[PDB]
Structures are given as structure tokens and as C-alpha cells.
């Protein structure tokens, strides 16, 4: 689960070489279907993703 009520079982363990790699070499470790947003309207997860990426990038800690 996330901190926004978005629960979900673990359905697969996707091999690390079959994951979509980014142009920076990275590779996600969680894949989250984008269809839980439209009906549940948890816009706080889409802001937490950006806040946490900015934190990990700048060494900061946002509130």
C-alpha cells in the first residue's frame, strides 16, 4: 500500500532485464497501473512521486 489508500496485491515479480529502463540507466522497482487514479482521485500520490524524486535528487526533505 501507499500512504494514500492505494492498496494492491503483488501479482508478478518482473525480471530485472524485462523492466523498462530509463534514459538515465535506472529501472523502476514498483510498477503501478495508471488506472487507479481516474476513479479514486488520489492526486496526492502524483505529488508525492515528484516531491520524493526532487528530495532524492537534491538531498533535501520536503514536507
Amino acid at each position: 500500500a501507499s500512504r494514500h489508500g492505494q492498496k494492491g496485491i503483488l501479482s508478478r515479480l518482473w525480471p530485472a532485464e524485462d523492466m523498462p529502463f530509463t534514459e538515465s540507466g535506472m529501472v523502476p522497482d514498483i510498477l503501478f497501473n495508471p488506472h487507479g487514479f481516474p476513479s479514486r482521485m488520489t492526486i496526492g500520490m502524483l505529488i508525492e512521486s515528484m516531491a520524493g524524486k526532487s528530495a532524492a535528487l537534491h538531498g533535501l526533505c520536503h514536507d
Partner: protein, 51 residues
């Protein structure tokens, strides 16, 4: 030589002790409002591409 009923009182006084109101200043908060989260100055990119 006994006690008899006398004339009815003509008025009543009720005493109470009361202090007064000061000016309205309405000093809501030490550091007031919800101060906004904001940009650290300069920051700089902490990541580069390969090549």
C-alpha cells in the same frame, strides 16, 4: 416593646464588582499564517547524462 413591620422599602440597590474592556488588537499568531514551502537558492543539477 416588640419588633413591628416598618414602611416598605422605596428602592433596591444591587452591587457587583466589574472590570472593563481593552482596545481590540486581535494579535492572532506569533509567527502568523501558514508560511509557504519554498526553493533552496541555486540548488544546481545533481545528475548528468552518460557520454
Amino acid at each position: 416593646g416588640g419588633l413591628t413591620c416598618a414602611s416598605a422599602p422605596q428602592g433596591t440597590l444591587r452591587i457587583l464588582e466589574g472590570p472593563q474592556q481593552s482596545l481590540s488588537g486581535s494579535p492572532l499568531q506569533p509567527i502568523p499564517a501558514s508560511p509557504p514551502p519554498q526553493i533552496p537558492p541555486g540548488l544546481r543539477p545533481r545528475f548528468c547524462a552518460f557520454g
